[PDB]
Amino acid sequence: MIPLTPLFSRYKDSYLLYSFRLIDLLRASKSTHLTKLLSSQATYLYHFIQKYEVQQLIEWAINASPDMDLQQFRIEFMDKTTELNLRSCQPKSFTYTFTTIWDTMHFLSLIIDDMVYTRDKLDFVMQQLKTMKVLFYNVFFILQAAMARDHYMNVKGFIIYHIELIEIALDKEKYGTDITFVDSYQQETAGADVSNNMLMKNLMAYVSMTFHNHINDYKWIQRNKKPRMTWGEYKKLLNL
Ligand X SMILES: Cc1cc2nc3c(=O)[nH]c(=O)nc-3n(C[C@H](O)[C@H](O)[C@H](O)COP(=O)(O)OP(=O)(O)OC[C@H]3O[C@@H](n4cnc5c(N)ncnc54)[C@H](O)[C@@H]3O)c2cc1C
What's the distance, Cα to Cα, between the start and end of the chain in Å? Answer: 11
Nearest-approach distance from CB 69 to its own copies, in angstroms: 35
Compare residues 67 and 232 and give the one whose CB is closer to ligand X: 232
* 235 binds, options its own copies, ligand X, none, Cβ within 5 to 8 A by partner type: none
* Residue 216 interacting entry, from its own copies, ligand X, none, C-beta within 5 to 8 Å by type: ligand X
Min separation Cβ 13 and ligand X, Å: 13
Picking from 178, 240, 170, 180, the residue whose alpha carbon sits closest to that of residue 208 is 240
Which residue type occupies 63? N
Minimum distance of ligand X from residue 208's CB (angstroms): 7
Q: Using CB distances below 5 to 8 A depending on partner kind, what does residue 28 bind out of ligand X, its own copies, none?
A: none
CA angle 230, 163, 196 (to 5 degrees): 90
List residues near its own copies by CB under 8 A. Answer: 133, 137, 153-161, 164-165, 167-168, 171, 175, 185-186, 189-190, 192-194, 210-211, 213-214, 217-218, 220-221, 226, 228, 230-231
The SS3 assignment for 149 reads helix
**DSSP per residue, 7-65:** HHHHHHHHHHHHHHHHHHHGGG--SHHHHHHHHHHHHHHHH--HHHHHHHHHHHHHHS-
Closer to ligand X by CB, 186 or 222: give it: 222
Name the minimum Å distance from CB 170 to ligand X. 18
- C-alpha 109, offset from chain centre: 6
CB 52 within 8 A of CB 71: no
C-beta closer to ligand X: residue 125 or 215: 215
Q: Give me the least distance between CB of 237 and ligand X, in Å please.
A: 8
- C-beta closer to ligand X: residue 64 or 135: 135
In terms of CB distance, is 27 or 133 closer to its own copies? Answer: 133
Nearer to ligand X, 37 or 215 (CB): 215
Cα–Cα distance for residue pair 169/174, rounded to 1 Å:
9
Beta-bridged to residue 181, according to DSSP, are 199
Between CA 234 and CA 240 the distance in angstroms is 8
Binding site for ligand X (CB under 6 A): 98-99, 101-102, 106, 139, 147-148, 151-152, 209, 212-213, 215-216, 219, 222, 229, 234
